[PDB]
Structure 1
């Protein structure tokens, strides 16, 4: 179960990365595209752990 959850989160992070690289990420108020990407990835990995 633990390894499945970690793999699912790695796939989620890879999807966020694909969306950011093909210019499809949704920015946030008071926040840059790169800061939005980093915040979303950090959220995903914290929830994975």
Structure 2
């Protein structure tokens, strides 16, 4: 189970890294009513919360 948890956390960190790259290269979709920074932060927070929930 520890290897599964580690793999899930690593996958989530890789996803966050990809989101960071997309935001830094203007490839990130913008949630309506929110700025680029706000959308980026919301997406990262959602990804990390899903990571913790999956590992748990």
State the structure with more CA Rg: 2
Give yes or no for TM over 0.5.
Answer: yes
* TM-score, reference length from structure 2: 0.86
Aligned length in residues: 49
1:18 partnered with 2:43: no
Instruction: Give 1:44 shift.
Output: 0.3
- Give, in whole Å, the separation in 1 of the partners of 2:23 and 2:37: 9
* TM-score, reference length from structure 1: 0.98
* Structure 1 segments unaligned to the other structure (5+ residues): none
Instruction: Give 1:40 shift.
Output: 0.3
Aligned structure 1 segments of 4 or more residues deviating by more than 3 angstroms: none
Give a deviation string over 1:1-49, Cα, whole Å, max 9, x none.
0000000000000000000001100001110000000000000000000
Alignment RMSD (CA, Å): 0.3
